[PDB]
Design a protein around this ligand. Structure first.
Ligand SMILES: O=c1ccn([C@@H]2O[C@H](COP(=O)(O)O)[C@@H](O)[C@H]2O)c(=O)[nH]1
Ligand SMILES: O=c1ccn([C@@H]2O[C@H](COP(=O)(O)O)[C@@H](O)[C@H]2O)c(=O)[nH]1
Ligand SMILES: O=c1ccn([C@@H]2O[C@H](COP(=O)(O)O)[C@@H](O)[C@H]2O)c(=O)[nH]1
Ligand SMILES: O=c1ccn([C@@H]2O[C@H](COP(=O)(O)O)[C@@H](O)[C@H]2O)c(=O)[nH]1
Ligand SMILES: O=c1ccn([C@@H]2O[C@H](COP(=O)(O)O)[C@@H](O)[C@H]2O)c(=O)[nH]1
Ligand SMILES: O=c1ccn([C@@H]2O[C@H](COP(=O)(O)O)[C@@H](O)[C@H]2O)c(=O)[nH]1
Ligand SMILES: [Mg+2]
Lengths: 67, 67, 67, 67, 67, 67
């Protein structure tokens, strides 16, 4: 219950909001959240890549989003 | 029970205290805690970004805060 | 239940899709997913090496794949 | 049960022993353990900052301490 | 159940296969898997050292191995 | 059950074997295992410091040890 991560990612996915996912190695990825589960997020643009959440620092939308 | 993280973050959120969140990659973020849950914190200023706690080193308020 | 990681990796394995596995240390590996379990993925080419998921940032297929 | 971390940190807190907390990013912090819980330690000096244990390498007291 | 890590490491141990264990800090170790458990692997050559799995990126055998 | 980490560390502690603990940040520590629990090891020499296991890569004894 009392989850914030699910509502957040689900909004970004539903509204097709472009995001930057900054990784713990300094790599910045860019795409749309196509899908997400317990341990991974699927980020689309050219191909859909599987990002491990443990590797993510911050999810930054290109636009403000509201829950 | 016996939690310290929840009371701490909830105070920073309630009192809108400006914080620095230092990440494990040396990146320093700055904003207000808008919201927080089990695995993430939502830090606001320009847009509300989702920070993974596993990526956080230290939360540093701009002012002393008391529990 | 509601898993996305298993369907994703199983597709890449079944269709023998070439992938890049980017590690949290900046190392890029390349091979085919031969096998995967709870904590590891087995990536084949010259020899089959065991990659720990906690060390993985992103799995990137050489081709789009559909679930 | 059979805990060593709690007795250790509680001693440092009770005796107000100055410590260095070395982080996994090479950052050295310095303060007094004001408080600690399951996932975080609160280190005081100028303001009380919340340090995530997953970000900590070693806790080093300025003086020997005994359990 | 459905484990792949145990069968893999147990084969390398049984057949005394020389391996490279690449760590998340870029350090490459070399030895034989003497033993392994839930959280650690014991790698032998000059002395038997205890490697934490959370620190391991990939296990790479010097020869192909089959399960 | 079927633990290898406990027997290993307990031997090093009992026999006062000098060890190098290599950390995931490249820092090499040196001391004697004074004590250990679920998440930490206490390494003695000048003062007894608390090392978090999640920060440890490998434990390397100065001498071979047998279980
Ligand atoms: O139910 C869960 C379990 C894990 N995680 C995320 O996956 C990461 C990887 O887990 P592992 O490294 O313990 C965690 O740090 C956390 O951010 C979740 O979002 N939900
Ligand atoms: O109930 C929980 C679970 C996890 N965490 C935090 O989320 C991080 C990511 O978990 P994962 O990497 O195992 C943990 O290190 C811890 O700081 C909490 O604050 N509360
Ligand atoms: O049932 C599980 C448990 C763990 N993991 C992955 O293995 C990583 C290593 O777990 P540990 O570091 O807590 C996790 O971050 C997560 O990505 C899974 O995919 N499924
Ligand atoms: O009951 C607990 C749970 C976790 N931790 C510490 O918090 C860290 C973050 O947990 P997460 O990254 O799985 C762990 O590595 C461990 O050092 C504890 O001290 N006690
Ligand atoms: O039953 C288990 C528990 C953990 N691990 C490994 O030990 C690592 C350290 O766990 P901790 O960092 O949550 C995990 O990422 C995973 O690779 C296993 O192989 N089996
Ligand atoms: O019963 C346990 C739990 C955790 N750990 C170690 O503590 C580390 C920190 O746990 P946390 O980061 O999930 C794990 O990776 C593992 O090496 C153990 O040795 N035994
Ligand atoms: Mg690092």
């Amino acid at each position: 219950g009392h989850s914030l991560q699910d509502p957040y990612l689900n909004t970004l996915r539903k509204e097709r909001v472009p995001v930057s996912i900054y990784l713990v190695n300094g790599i910045k990825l860019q795409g749309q959240i196509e899908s997400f589960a317990q341990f991974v997020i699927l980020l689309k643009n050219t191909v859909s890549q599987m990002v491990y959440k443990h590797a993510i620092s911050t999810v930054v939308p290109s636009r403000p989003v509201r829950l």
